[PDB]
Point group: C4
Chain length 277, copies 4
């Protein structure tokens, strides 16, 4: 009804970054991922793989001691801030990060909110997902805050019931991005990407292969990595959401949509991203 | 002798579900898998991979603390109910599940039977396999109970000796499905799928590549996932057994039947299932 | 000089077993693998993968508690006898196995020899490798004993110096197979397979891709599995040694011989074995 | 400005070693890798995979107890010296190694320098990387010492600021290789390989796919393995640096340069190395 435009293949091709010959890992920054807990460890691996696949320089994973060993053999390229998401509840970060994500596989607790409050004093884009999403307001800061709710999480954030939300997705997402002054990636078929300056887009990619545990955890990681290699954080968010869906569409060419596992999205991204270069 | 019909490719094609564009993981439900023990941990990974490959929305694995870390790196998409199969012995489940499986890699003990008794008070289909199979009766409930014995397990359940059973497989399977009022998937070459309402089918797929440890553990998982995406639980059971065998037949096109490992069935299923769409 | 014949492709094709449609895992037996220690854990994974790829029904791995978790995610199809190689030092095995292997990654100790002495009271073929190879004699028993030394291990077994051995490999291997009344698989380019009844063969397959840690550990496993699916244990040994080498020759078609990792031999075997069917 | 020649495909083809039919693992030696720590475990897996892929006979990894289990499932072919990098601080090595590398994922501490001092009393090539790089001098010894700094590490070693270094890379690398009497592999686009006898080369391979955490850890391992199979250690260093870059160039043919993970370099090397045979 609002005629929200799609972020199309043409926009993706025009905005994906180069990886220059005269670059090193520092050029692409160090990201921090605060994710994973004892009974939801896998979300950290999923988001970590999404992040490292998505063009960052380095990744530090701040997770519980028991989660670390479960990541290493699959994603040996990441390093660790031991019990980092718990530690983040106690103090401002002393390390400089290019971008930070918090929430996948974290319990939805006040301690996690304390960690969010500390991370927001950093000068970098911050993504809040999953257990880091709550009903709250956000401090004025320079770097964007990017919230990635599915409709259930949006209800938790706003009190807008899911059945009402789903009738007017872009309208609600835009209204709340404006009110909160955050980016809102309202997930679902035709994901809405609403910016607090009023810009808004729909994502045209993806299918029901994505309707399975873990896929949003992977997405959070993809956004985190893309924030590190794109000059414009808006493009990073839009390209992450687009390519995430494009990976599922590649899968379904020769595989049943019932059968995708989220980590395979990260495995598919290398070839999919090349197509748009 | 009874002229039991085969569940054929035509029946599979006619009954496999769509994965709608306007779905999310909740559409396809959360399954519970109660499996894996200290000296048989791998059965939990095998059944978990089968389940998550088979069209569910989410999977919770209730297994021993020592088993959890062995699953995560391979199947990061699952979450955990820590010591869940032991905990299930103590109380009705407070969580709602779309379908539940219990038994792979569980010791054949009275505590496991206590867990079975608690899970059966849930209102969902329940699969009993392996260490959860015993000589017993089943309470009247709305959701189907699906037993998945091989002939040795059927002897344990019924007292019918294996050598006698194997001469009259469909007759025994039908008789006992009726007596117990459970589904019985009596495994073997030409697996019998006997329903307590008298319907019965033979499975036409599979080969001796399946004659190796773990393959029945994978099957239990495949049934669990298919119960979550099929409207008719009968079709879910029949399609799981069929596709499980079809995966082994794909394998043997270019690989020796002596050399299959059960987890590869789950890896093959994506492409095999696409063929029937 | 003795004109020892090669075990050729024709002999392999004539002797590889069928996997019948009317078989189950029990048809192909349960093997026991006694392997792996705290600072050499990987040998257990290598031999376990070789075994399960090679046509057995089930595999029990008797290894240290700390080794178990390192196997499971890669070879979830195996089950465990916790601290089994240590436990085997204390008593005859109460379980019936189709075939047993002992030694890969085990320290070369008197306790391991105690375990060997207990395993030899079983009525099945037994393979001794690596840390289970010592200077000793063997009791009269029905099942074959198969020793798998490289030339260094043969020196340890016999006192024949390596430089002397390597000039007259088949002569020494035959002499000592006769004296000990064991099979001896004397490894190296042109591996010698010497039977205690005087039969002897050379293996024509393999290349320097195999000249790297772990490949003999994989071989022990391959022999173990092949003993479970071949009616004639002689053929099992000969086909294992042949196919092990054939896997390296496949690898080198498109990969450098400097770059093979032993576990990949197990990954290649499915396609290689199909070629000989 | 100095007209430093490139180490070209022709030089690689002329100097890569054969893997003879009449070789065994001992022919290619046992390497020691001292790498990996609790919050940087993955560097040990990365360097270990690079090493074992690169033509050694055996690899011993001296790492922390907590790191060992994270390597085994992915690189089962390696064995361990438990807490070896810490133990190396206390005494000369009693074991003979073909080549030794120290530093990836090790904290940059005086204890690591103590380990370096002990390893240098061995008679073999030694590679120092990462946490083993410090401002120091080196004792006269027969085997080469190979330092592998990126420009930040070179600043730490020398006091030459990065912005100055990067204007005159070959000049500085040559000057300091001469002063220290070590090989210096000064990383970056157009890596400089400077020998203490005055020979110097530029590497023509690689791209921004390498500008991500872990890739230098992999390289250290590749050098370690190549030192074991090349007769001339100069060629080993030059071929490792060249092939490492060539692997990234293969990747980018069909994958985006933003998306490479370092361990995949090791996975690509088998096919890339074959191209130069
Ligand atoms: N492997 C791991 O470690 C995994 C970890 N994970 C972690 O689990 C944590 C909890 O996150 P979660 O999303 O699983 O559960 P939760 O917040 O209760 O939301 C469900 C509610 O939202 C609703 N709803 C959602 N989408 C909707 C739509 N399109 N349209 C309509 N309704 C929609 C849904 O509605 P329903 O289907 O019930 O109608 C239900 O009410 C979090 O930390 C996450 O990172 C998971 O990613 C799993 C894999
Ligand atoms: N990796 C893991 O964690 C693994 C875990 N697993 C777990 O192990 C547990 C025990 O289950 P299991 O099936 O291994 O042994 P068990 O119940 O003793 O049955 C064998 C008996 O049945 C018979 N029999 C079977 N089929 C037959 C047929 N077609 N036709 C005829 N006879 C037939 C067979 O006969 P036989 O060959 O002796 O004549 C023998 O008497 C269970 O929890 C399972 O999940 C396993 O899946 C292994 C991988
Ligand atoms: N990942 C793991 O867990 C791994 C574990 N492993 C475990 O390590 C344990 C020790 O076994 P191992 O074979 O590594 O050492 P060891 O018995 O000292 O033998 C070397 C001696 O033999 C000689 N020699 C050998 N072949 C020869 C030939 N063709 N021709 C001539 N000489 C020959 C060689 O001679 P050299 O080269 O010194 O002249 C040297 O003297 C064992 O339990 C094994 O399973 C390994 O498999 C590694 C991967
Ligand atoms: N998965 C794991 O276990 C991993 C483990 N690892 C381990 O981490 C440890 C620390 O090593 P590290 O290289 O990450 O950090 P560090 O020494 O602080 O160097 C950065 C400094 O150097 C500079 N700089 C570098 N290149 C440059 C260039 N071309 N041109 C210009 N400047 C350049 C850079 O400059 P900047 O970008 O800031 O301008 C910054 O100042 C080590 O043990 C390693 O093995 C890592 O490999 C990660 C994966
Ligand atoms: N049917 C669908 N079509 C397109 N995208 C979907 C579909 N189902 C799920 N997704 C995407 O999958 C992810 C689910 O996130 P979450 O529930 O946090 O795991 C989001 O990126 C969704 O937009
Ligand atoms: N020879 C065979 N032909 C067809 N299916 C088989 C064969 N051997 C085993 N299977 C199947 O493999 C599984 C074995 O289950 P289980 O013994 O519980 O692991 C069941 O699905 C069997 O029907
Ligand atoms: N150059 C080679 N040619 C053929 N086979 C080889 C070669 N080097 C090693 N092997 C085989 O690799 C294995 C090495 O065993 P081991 O030393 O116990 O790991 C044996 O099967 C050897 O016969
Ligand atoms: N843009 C680039 N072009 C070529 N090689 C690169 C590039 N960025 C990084 N590398 C290589 O990647 C490795 C980085 O090492 P390090 O920082 O120790 O992980 C070295 O081998 C670098 O020369
Ligand atoms: Mg989510
Ligand atoms: Mg079973
Ligand atoms: Mg050996
Ligand atoms: Mg480095």
């Amino acid at each position: 009804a609002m005629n929200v435009p799609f972020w199309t293949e043409e926009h993706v091709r025009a905005t994906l970054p180069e990886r220059d010959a005269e670059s090193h890992k520092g050029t692409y920054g160090t990201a921090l991922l605060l994710a994973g807990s004892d009974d939801m460890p896998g979300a950290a691996l999923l988001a970590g793989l999404g992040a490292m696949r998505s063009g960052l320089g380095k990744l530090v994973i701040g997770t519980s001691e028991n989660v670390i060993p479960l990541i290493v053999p699959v994603l040996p390229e990441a390093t660790y801030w031991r019990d980092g998401w718990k530690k983040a509840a106690d103090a401002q970060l002393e390390e400089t990060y290019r971008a930070i994500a918090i929430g996948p596989g974290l319990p939805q607790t006040e301690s996690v909110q304390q960690a969010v409050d500390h991370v927001l004093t950093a000068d970098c884009p911050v993504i809040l997902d999953a257990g880091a999403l709550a009903k709250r307001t956000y401090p004025k800061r320079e770097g964007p805050v990017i919230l990635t709710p599915h409709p259930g999480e949006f209800f938790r954030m706003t009190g807008v019931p899911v059945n009402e939300l789903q009738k007017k997705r872009a309208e609600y997402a835009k209204e709340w991005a404006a009110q909160l002054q955050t980016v809102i990636v309202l997930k679902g078929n035709q994901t809405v990407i609403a910016f607090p300056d009023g810009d808004c887009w729909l994502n045209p990619t993806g299918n029901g292969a994505l309707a399975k545990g873990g896929t949003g955890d992977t997405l959070t990681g993809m956004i985190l990595g893309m924030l590190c290699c794109h000059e414009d954080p808006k493009h990073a968010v839009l390209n992450a959401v687009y390519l995430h869906g494009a990976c599922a569409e590649l899968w379904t060419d020769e595989h049943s949509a019932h059968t995708l596992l989220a980590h395979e999205l990260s495995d598919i991204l290398p070839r999919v991203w090349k197509r748009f270069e």
